[PDB]
């Protein structure tokens, strides 16, 4: 059984995620509209980069609500968020993938297909893994609690670059891993391999993070510049 502390924490991560989602779709009409070459492709790219900026702000606001994140130094708080942002973005992207339409819905009604992603200015080398991962995630069928716990485990990764106190980070990850392991045993007691399969997704997210780095490097060669916010997180 889950302890009262485990239950309240799980519910709090779920509540923190619903709140980020609610205040984001509320602040949706303040995004460059989605519209033939030149100017329209520039506008399409500006639209797509603005959605990423909203997600970075959302992730930062969620992290602050994650118990234990405020125990870390400002230094390590940045180091963890810097590396986790895209991995969290991809997890959330997989969560808004529709099997019937083969489309990802950002915010409230912004719906995108594989073609729409290529129109925004992304490589097939990066689009295919997104949808490949989105379909792979659909097969697990994670609830709001399992998604929230996975993000918390992803945030508190001690092996991230520039982490001054990895011991502190590893100690903070432990209660979340314990919570997900307990939740899994309660939810589906028949499927013992549900928990390792969720952790195998963290393995996949690291490869996807490298693919995303290759996508950013490709944009520099394509003379497409990133906004000041996204440049701070995703550049050499
Ligand atoms: C050109 C570079 C800088 N890129 C982009 O401009 C971008 N824009 C879309 C941002 C997704 C916003 C998003 C994610 C997840 C959840 C919610 S939300 N607001 O609906 O909760 N929004 C990327 C992206 C695409 C798919 C998955 C992850 C990243 S990119 O890094 O290739």
Author numbering: 219 to 253, 259 to 459
The authors write:
In this study, we compared AZ876 with structurally related compounds AZ1–6. These compounds have a central cyclic sulfone amide scaffold with lipophilic substituents on both sides identical to AZ876, except for the tert-butyl substituent replaced by a propyl group in AZ1–3 and AZ6. The third substituent from the core is a larger elongated amine linker that is different in AZ1–6. The amine linker is mostly lipophilic with a polar group at the far end. The compounds AZ1, AZ3, and BMS-852927 have the highest affinities of 2, 4, and 3 nM, and the compounds AZ6, AZ7, and 24,25EC have the lowest affinities of 161, 105, and 133 nM, respectively. Analysis of crystal structures of LXRβ LBD in complex with WAY-254011, AZ3, AZ6, and AZ8, as well as of previously published crystal structures of LXRβ31,40,55 reveals that GW3965 and BMS-852927 are the only compounds not forming a direct hydrogen bond with LXRβ His435 and therefore they do not stabilize the His435–Trp457 activation switch crucial for the agonistic conformation of H12. Other agonists form shorter hydrogen bonds of 2.5–3.1 Å essential for proper position of H12, which correlates with their activities both in LXRβ HDX-MS and functional assays. Overall, most of the selected compounds displayed similar differential HDX patterns with a strong protection from deuterium exchange observed for the peptides lining the LBP: central part of H3, H5, β-sheet, and helices H6, H7, and H10/11.
